[PDB]
Amino acid sequence: GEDLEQEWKPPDEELIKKLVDQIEFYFSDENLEKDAFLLKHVRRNKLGYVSVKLLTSFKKVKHLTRDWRTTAHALKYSVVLELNEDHRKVRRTTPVPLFPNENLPS
């Protein structure tokens, strides 16, 4: 039997702490004020979901990891965020408050 695997080897506990700590602050209001791009995607959704292939490739996260699977494992350890059905997206447990840029009628 030569069929490819349907899984991978997840990160160590210490990598997870760094990885989750980035994604945690990425959904905080203090990041949303400066990252209008990420603010758009979280505001786009009814629940707040953002793709893990983007989140893993963020300006800090790239120093640690550039892999949606490796970040997807770390979503399980989140205390303020929730993964989706196959761990391909994550949303903040609370709806993110509206920003001045969202009040525009354009």
mmCIF file of C-alpha atoms in Angstrom:
data_model
loop_
_atom_site.group_PDB
_atom_site.id
_atom_site.type_symbol
_atom_site.label_atom_id
_atom_site.label_comp_id
_atom_site.label_asym_id
_atom_site.label_seq_id
_atom_site.Cartn_x
_atom_site.Cartn_y
_atom_site.Cartn_z
ATOM 1 C CA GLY A 1 0.000 0.000 0.000
ATOM 2 C CA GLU A 2 1.657 3.229 -1.299
ATOM 3 C CA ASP A 3 -1.179 5.812 -0.688
ATOM 4 C CA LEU A 4 -0.150 9.271 0.684
ATOM 5 C CA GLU A 5 -0.876 10.185 4.360
ATOM 6 C CA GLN A 6 -3.906 12.385 5.355
ATOM 7 C CA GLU A 7 -2.053 14.059 8.304
ATOM 8 C CA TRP A 8 1.352 15.579 9.344
ATOM 9 C CA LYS A 9 3.705 15.997 12.388
ATOM 10 C CA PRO A 10 2.550 19.005 14.558
ATOM 11 C CA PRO A 11 4.908 21.522 16.327
ATOM 12 C CA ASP A 12 6.440 21.344 19.837
ATOM 13 C CA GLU A 13 4.797 22.992 22.917
ATOM 14 C CA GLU A 14 7.221 26.004 22.851
ATOM 15 C CA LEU A 15 6.620 26.727 19.114
ATOM 16 C CA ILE A 16 2.838 26.524 19.862
ATOM 17 C CA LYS A 17 3.141 29.205 22.662
ATOM 18 C CA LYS A 18 4.798 31.663 20.192
ATOM 19 C CA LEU A 19 2.433 30.752 17.284
ATOM 20 C CA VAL A 20 -0.849 31.049 19.324
ATOM 21 C CA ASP A 21 0.451 34.270 21.005
ATOM 22 C CA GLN A 22 0.784 35.934 17.562
ATOM 23 C CA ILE A 23 -2.672 34.799 16.291
ATOM 24 C CA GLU A 24 -4.223 35.868 19.660
ATOM 25 C CA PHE A 25 -3.020 39.515 19.358
ATOM 26 C CA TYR A 26 -3.830 39.477 15.586
ATOM 27 C CA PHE A 27 -7.587 39.405 16.447
ATOM 28 C CA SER A 28 -7.150 41.976 19.319
ATOM 29 C CA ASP A 29 -8.454 45.547 18.730
ATOM 30 C CA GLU A 30 -4.836 46.877 19.046
ATOM 31 C CA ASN A 31 -3.762 44.973 15.871
ATOM 32 C CA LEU A 32 -7.059 45.771 14.039
ATOM 33 C CA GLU A 33 -6.392 49.552 14.494
ATOM 34 C CA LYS A 34 -3.083 49.260 12.456
ATOM 35 C CA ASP A 35 -3.855 46.246 10.130
ATOM 36 C CA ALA A 36 -6.892 47.429 8.118
ATOM 37 C CA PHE A 37 -6.335 44.402 5.793
ATOM 38 C CA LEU A 38 -6.886 41.807 8.606
ATOM 39 C CA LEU A 39 -9.698 44.011 10.041
ATOM 40 C CA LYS A 40 -11.448 43.725 6.602
ATOM 41 C CA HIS A 41 -11.394 39.859 6.591
ATOM 42 C CA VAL A 42 -12.589 39.536 10.245
ATOM 43 C CA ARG A 43 -15.367 42.163 9.550
ATOM 44 C CA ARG A 44 -16.266 40.339 6.228
ATOM 45 C CA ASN A 45 -17.583 37.274 8.091
ATOM 46 C CA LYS A 46 -20.711 36.624 10.175
ATOM 47 C CA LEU A 47 -18.565 34.768 12.805
ATOM 48 C CA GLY A 48 -15.126 36.387 12.036
ATOM 49 C CA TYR A 49 -13.230 33.585 10.171
ATOM 50 C CA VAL A 50 -9.802 34.142 8.509
ATOM 51 C CA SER A 51 -7.803 31.549 6.475
ATOM 52 C CA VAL A 52 -4.842 29.912 8.305
ATOM 53 C CA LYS A 53 -2.551 30.044 5.171
ATOM 54 C CA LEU A 54 -2.715 33.874 5.504
ATOM 55 C CA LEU A 55 -2.386 33.924 9.338
ATOM 56 C CA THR A 56 0.744 31.672 9.226
ATOM 57 C CA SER A 57 2.300 34.063 6.632
ATOM 58 C CA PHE A 58 1.943 37.224 8.831
ATOM 59 C CA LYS A 59 4.822 39.671 9.435
ATOM 60 C CA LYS A 60 5.744 38.175 12.856
ATOM 61 C CA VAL A 61 4.479 34.591 12.251
ATOM 62 C CA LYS A 62 6.821 34.095 9.228
ATOM 63 C CA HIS A 63 9.803 34.286 11.650
ATOM 64 C CA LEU A 64 8.511 31.007 13.277
ATOM 65 C CA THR A 65 6.275 29.219 10.679
ATOM 66 C CA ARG A 66 4.855 29.402 7.063
ATOM 67 C CA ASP A 67 2.453 26.411 7.249
ATOM 68 C CA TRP A 68 -1.310 26.337 7.777
ATOM 69 C CA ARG A 69 -1.132 22.811 9.385
ATOM 70 C CA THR A 70 1.530 23.857 11.927
ATOM 71 C CA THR A 71 -0.592 26.933 12.867
ATOM 72 C CA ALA A 72 -3.822 24.787 12.806
ATOM 73 C CA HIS A 73 -2.443 22.630 15.672
ATOM 74 C CA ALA A 74 -1.779 25.852 17.698
ATOM 75 C CA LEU A 75 -5.476 26.954 17.198
ATOM 76 C CA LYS A 76 -6.435 24.065 19.587
ATOM 77 C CA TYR A 77 -4.492 25.844 22.403
ATOM 78 C CA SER A 78 -6.188 29.266 21.769
ATOM 79 C CA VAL A 79 -8.062 30.686 24.820
ATOM 80 C CA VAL A 80 -9.816 33.567 22.875
ATOM 81 C CA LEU A 81 -10.173 32.076 19.324
ATOM 82 C CA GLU A 82 -12.001 29.112 17.665
ATOM 83 C CA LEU A 83 -10.863 26.922 14.709
ATOM 84 C CA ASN A 84 -13.309 25.771 11.950
ATOM 85 C CA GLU A 85 -14.406 22.183 10.988
ATOM 86 C CA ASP A 86 -11.107 21.035 9.289
ATOM 87 C CA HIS A 87 -8.890 23.675 11.087
ATOM 88 C CA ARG A 88 -8.480 25.720 7.788
ATOM 89 C CA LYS A 89 -9.848 28.999 9.335
ATOM 90 C CA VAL A 90 -10.072 30.644 12.822
ATOM 91 C CA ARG A 91 -12.406 33.310 14.337
ATOM 92 C CA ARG A 92 -12.244 35.420 17.545
ATOM 93 C CA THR A 93 -14.674 34.083 20.254
ATOM 94 C CA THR A 94 -16.170 37.638 20.471
ATOM 95 C CA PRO A 95 -17.373 39.771 17.517
ATOM 96 C CA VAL A 96 -14.696 42.479 16.946
ATOM 97 C CA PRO A 97 -15.947 46.057 17.640
ATOM 98 C CA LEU A 98 -16.596 48.319 14.630
ATOM 99 C CA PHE A 99 -13.850 50.814 13.608
ATOM 100 C CA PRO A 100 -14.147 54.412 12.159
ATOM 101 C CA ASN A 101 -13.268 53.048 8.668
ATOM 102 C CA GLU A 102 -16.313 50.656 8.860
ATOM 103 C CA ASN A 103 -18.755 53.582 9.514
ATOM 104 C CA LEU A 104 -18.246 54.920 5.906
ATOM 105 C CA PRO A 105 -21.239 54.402 3.469
ATOM 106 C CA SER A 106 -18.959 53.667 0.394
#
